[PDB]
Amino acid sequence: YFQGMPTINSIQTTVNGVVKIVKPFNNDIAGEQFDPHVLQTLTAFKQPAILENDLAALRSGSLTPAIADPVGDAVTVQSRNITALNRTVSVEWLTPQNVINHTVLVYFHGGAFYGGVPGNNTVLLKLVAAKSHCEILNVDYSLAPEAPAPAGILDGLAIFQYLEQRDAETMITVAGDSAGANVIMAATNLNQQLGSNRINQQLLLYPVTAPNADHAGPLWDLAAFPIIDSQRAILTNYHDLFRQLDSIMTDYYVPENFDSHSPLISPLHQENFTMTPPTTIMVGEFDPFRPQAWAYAQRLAAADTATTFIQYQGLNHAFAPLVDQYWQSQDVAQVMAAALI
Amino acid sequence: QGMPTINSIQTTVNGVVKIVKPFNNDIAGEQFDPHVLQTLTAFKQPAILENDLAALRSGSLTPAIADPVGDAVTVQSRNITALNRTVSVEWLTPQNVINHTVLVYFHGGAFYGGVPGNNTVLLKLVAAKSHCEILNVDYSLAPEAPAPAGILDGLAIFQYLEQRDAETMITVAGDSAGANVIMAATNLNQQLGSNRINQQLLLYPVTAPNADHAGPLWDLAAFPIIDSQRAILTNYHDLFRQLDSIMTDYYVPENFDSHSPLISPLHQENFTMTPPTTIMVGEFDPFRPQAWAYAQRLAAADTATTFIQYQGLNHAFAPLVDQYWQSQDVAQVMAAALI
Numbered sequence: 001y002f003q004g005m006p007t008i009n010s011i012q013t014t015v016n017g018v019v020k021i022v023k024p025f026n027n028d029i030a031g032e033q034f035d036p037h038v039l040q041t042l043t044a045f046k047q048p049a050i051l052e053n054d055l056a057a058l059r060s061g062s063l064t065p066a067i068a069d070p071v072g073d074a075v076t077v078q079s080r081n082i083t084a085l086n087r088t089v090s091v092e093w094l095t096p097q098n099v100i101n102h103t104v105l106v107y108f109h110g111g112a113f114y115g116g117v118p119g120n121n122t123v124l125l126k127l128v129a130a131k132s133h134c135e136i137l138n139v140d141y142s143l144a145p146e147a148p149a150p151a152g153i154l155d156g157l158a159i160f161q162y163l164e165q166r167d168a169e170t171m172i173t174v175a176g177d178s179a180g181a182n183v184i185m186a187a188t189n190l191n192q193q194l195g196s197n198r199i200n201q202q203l204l205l206y207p208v209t210a211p212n213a214d215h216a217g218p219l220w221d222l223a224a225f226p227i228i229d230s231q232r233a234i235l236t237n238y239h240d241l242f243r244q245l246d247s248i249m250t251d252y253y254v255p256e257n258f259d260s261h262s263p264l265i266s267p268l269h270q271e272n273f274t275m276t277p278p279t280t281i282m283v284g285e286f287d288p289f290r291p292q293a294w295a296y297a298q299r300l301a302a303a304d305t306a307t308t309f310i311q312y313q314g315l316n317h318a319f320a321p322l323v324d325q326y327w328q329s330q331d332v333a334q335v336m337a338a339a340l341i
Numbered sequence: 342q343g344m345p346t347i348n349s350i351q352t353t354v355n356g357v358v359k360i361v362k363p364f365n366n367d368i369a370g371e372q373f374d375p376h377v378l379q380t381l382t383a384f385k386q387p388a389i390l391e392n393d394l395a396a397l398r399s400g401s402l403t404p405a406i407a408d409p410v411g412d413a414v415t416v417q418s419r420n421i422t423a424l425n426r427t428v429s430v431e432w433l434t435p436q437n438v439i440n441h442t443v444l445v446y447f448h449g450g451a452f453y454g455g456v457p458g459n460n461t462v463l464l465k466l467v468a469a470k471s472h473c474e475i476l477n478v479d480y481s482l483a484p485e486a487p488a489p490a491g492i493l494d495g496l497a498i499f500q501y502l503e504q505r506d507a508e509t510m511i512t513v514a515g516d517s518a519g520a521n522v523i524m525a526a527t528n529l530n531q532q533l534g535s536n537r538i539n540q541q542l543l544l545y546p547v548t549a550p551n552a553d554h555a556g557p558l559w560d561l562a563a564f565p566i567i568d569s570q571r572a573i574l575t576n577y578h579d580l581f582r583q584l585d586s587i588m589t590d591y592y593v594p595e596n597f598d599s600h601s602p603l604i605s606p607l608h609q610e611n612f613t614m615t616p617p618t619t620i621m622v623g624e625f626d627p628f629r630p631q632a633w634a635y636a637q638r639l640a641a642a643d644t645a646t647t648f649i650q651y652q653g654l655n656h657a658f659a660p661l662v663d664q665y666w667q668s669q670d671v672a673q674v675m676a677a678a679l680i
Contacts, residue, residue: 040366043346056413056435056469061342063409065666066376117407119663146412322343 001070001127002334005327017301018294018309023328025314031285033228034235035314037326038286042316045237051244055114055145055252062115068324071126079140084158084165091159092118092138096129102169103340105136105203106159108152110178110318112245113144113211113253121177121321124333131337137163141183144253149265156187164198173201173340174277177320178289179249181207185267192275202279203336205320206287209296210268212250212260215243219292227286235286242288242317268296273303280308280339282332284315310335344666356640357648362670364653370624372567373574374653376665377625381655384576390583394453394484397587401454407663410465423497423504430498431457433475435468441508442679444475445498449517449544449657451584452483452491452592460516460660463672470676476502480522483591488604495526496533503537512540512679513616516659517628518588520546524606531614541618542675544659545626548607548635551589551599554582558631566625574625577655581627607635612642619647619678621671623654649674 011022025035034042051058076095081088107125109116118138125136139159142151156174163170176184181204188199213219220243227235254260263270270276281297283290290311300307312319312328323329350361364374373381391397415434420427446464448455457477464475478498481490495513502509515523520543527538552558559582566574593599602609609615618639622632629650639646651658651667662668 037345040345041343054436054469056410056465059410059413060466060469060672063407063663063669064343065662065669066664068375111409115409117409119407143411318343325343325345 001130002330005330016298017304018297018307021308021310023310023312023331025312025328029314031313032226033314034231034286034316035326035328038314038316038319039231039234042234042238045234045241048237049241049244051241051248053248053251058112058248059115062111062120063117064120064321067123067321069123069126071123071130075126075129077122077126082159082162084161085154087155087158089155089158090140092122092140094125094129094136094138096133096135098133099135100133100341102167103134103171103173104163105134105173105175105340106156106163106184107136107138108141108156108176108180108184109138110176110180111143112249113148113152113179113183114249115143116180124321124323124329127323127330127333128336128340131333132340134340141180148255149253149258150186152183153186153190153264156184157190160187160191160196160199164196170198172199173203174199175203175205175336176207177205178318179208179211179253181205182209182211182267185209186264188277189264189267189270189275199277201277201339203339204279204281204293205332206283206289206317207267207281207293207296208289210266210292211253212246213266213292215246219295220288221291224291225286238286238316239288268292268299270299273299273305276300276303276305278306280310280335282310282312282320282335284317284319285311285313286315287317289317355637356643357636357646360647360649362649362651362667364651364667368653370652371565372653373570373625373655374665374667377653377655377658378570378573381573381577384573384580387576388580390580390587392587397451398454401450402456403459403660406462406661408462408465410462410469414465414468416461416465421498421501423500424493426493426497428494428497429479431461431477431479433464433468433477435472435474437472438474439472439680441506442473442510442512443502444473444512444514444679445495445502445523446475446477447480447491447495447515447519447523448477449515449519450482451588452487452518452522453588454482455519463660463662463668466662466669466672467675467679470673471679473679480519487594488592488597489525491522492526492529492603495523496529499526499530499535499538503535509537511538512542513538514542514544514675515546516544517657518547518592520544521548521550521606524548525603527616528603528606528609538616540616540678542678543618543620543632544671545622545628545656546606546620546632546635547628549605549631550592551585552605552607552631554585558634559627560630563630564625577625578627581656607631607638609638612638612644615639615642615644617645619649619674621649621651621659621674623656623658624650624652625654626656628656
């Protein structure tokens with residue numbers, strides 16, 4: 001499934017205990033500009049964006065039309081309901097040929113806590129299942145504001161309990177992208193505080209680790225994103241849109257009795273990272289959430305948890321499911337499958 | 342929304358604003374969008390149409406379409422009564438509805454079939470983006486209620502809306518055969534002297550049911566395509582030619598005629614009262630030539646007319662918002678025409 005891919009010279013270093021892998025978008029450009037395939041999608045950001053705080057309008061921009069599917073029949077995709085903790089959760093269940101025992105992956109889609117659908121990343125996960133021969137749960141977890149924090153977190157815990165009671169030898173890898181990664185990270189933390197040790201790995205695609213962090217702070221500073229002149233207005237406008245989204249989405253996700261800076265809403269602000277599973281983070285050079293993902297990686301490493309931080313040069317937010325658009329998305333699938341076997 | 346910007350091509354032809362949108366930036370036309378092509382594998386051989394009502398109706402139902410909006414747009418069934426006709430409507434109401442503007446939509450389904458639910462998600466997208474309330478009408482279906490029952494259901498809806506709010510501005514819309522019915526109802530509403538309908542939004546409309554199949558509106562030569570896809574197009578086009586006769590037969594009772602102005606809007610004697618219109622249609626839709634012929638007649642009556650051609654696309658694509666970027670573009674074009 002991974003042919004026609006470029007031979008990229010990646011750069012691997014160790015920074016504060018973090019294994020860092022920087023992958024340029026080609027071998028002639030090391031950084032500081034968008035991958036050209038990304039750039040052609042960002043034409044709108046030549047002008048500033050004003051994000052209207054309207055739920056339906058926001059949701060209406062969170063459906064990805066079908067991605068070309070090279071896997072086809074080689075992986076079965078079927079929906080079913082599971083029930084634990086008096087919560088019924090719909091999951092899109094992926095089964096490959098010759099499925100392997102015990103190892104299972106649980107995935108939460110992104111969509112800024114309030115939107116998206118699991119179908120947004122089906123094809124990416126078919127690639128992962130087909131390569132690793134691992135079964136995958138693509139979870140239709142609760143969305144805010146109708147079911148704000150901690151509903152999605154509790155759905156995750158329900159899923160983990162179901163899997164562990166189903167099979168005592170199960171090894172669970174948790175994964176997600178964006179706000180979905182945030183929710184499953186919190187569920188994982190909670191699973192561990194109840195004494196389960198079955199989750200042995202996190203695979204996080206551009207996670208939101210600190211929702212609604214200070215937008216005049218170091219996590220939201222555009223000076224951390226050097227870029228060529230011709231693309232600096234586009235980058236500024238793009239980053240500013242995500243700054244707007246960060247506030248709007250957190251308001252939806254967090255009810256009034258709760259707070260966004262708490263450990264279960266901002267995994268970056270956990271008091272302790274010693275229980276956290278070995279983690280791989282994958283993120284674009286120009287992802288507005290990259291600094292907080294890096295800060296998270298450094299906290300894990302300092303707690304002596306093995307952490308790999310793969311930075312895709314020239315990439316923005318939300319690229320990974322787009323396997324028919326970017327080689328980097330195909331690489332994300334490869335990296336995930338290798339982590340499961 | 343990682344969509345590579347598509348570079349559309351806008352020209353003006355006989356007063357018609359024509360907007361051609363390639364399915365990507367490498368290919369300008371003359372082949373199917375690969376997303377569409379993978380659904381047409383069966384058409385490597387001639388198709389077999391099961392000509393009986395139950396089979397035809399079952400084939401006019403869309404399987405479930407992913408819905409990203411959910412409860413953020415309210416959807417409820419209400420009946421309205423006007424002209425002694427009771428019409429069920431699936432009503433879509435967004436949060437913070439705008440005043441006076443309202444959209445009335447008629448589903449496709451070849452006059453005998455389809456259900457409002459076929460295009461519910463598409464319309465939630467439109468309501469979300471426009472803040473406009475939408476009536477997704479369950480209009481009368483042939484042959485139990487053939488022409489002009491659906492037309493009269495449309496007129497009853499318009500009367501209900503206009504007596505409800507004297508300053509309402511109505512946009513009428515629909516796809517395929519539904520567009521046909523609501524276009525005729527619009528014509529009728531205008532002939533009774535209402536001017537509250539100020540726009541039409543037409544998704545691959547059937548403007549001339551059962552037109553001459555040996556004539557220019559049904560000539561395959563109008564659809565140049567690469568050799569590797571000619572067989573598929575030929576069989577797809579042939580299926581629709583057959584369906585054209587069958588559906589018109591169900592729709593049109595013996596005492597009436599398909600060539601008449603109220604069954605074939607293309608054959609209206611006069612287009613001067615016709616509202617400003619946007620038509621959206623695929624490059625390989627068999628009803629594309631009759632849609633274009635209609636647009637030309639509009640523009641010749643000095644009515645603002647926009648014709649949007651989606652390259653590589655076939656018939657009935659618009660509700661499938663989880664399948665094609667073009668389906669979402671349709672929702673955006675419609676939302677933009679309502680605000």
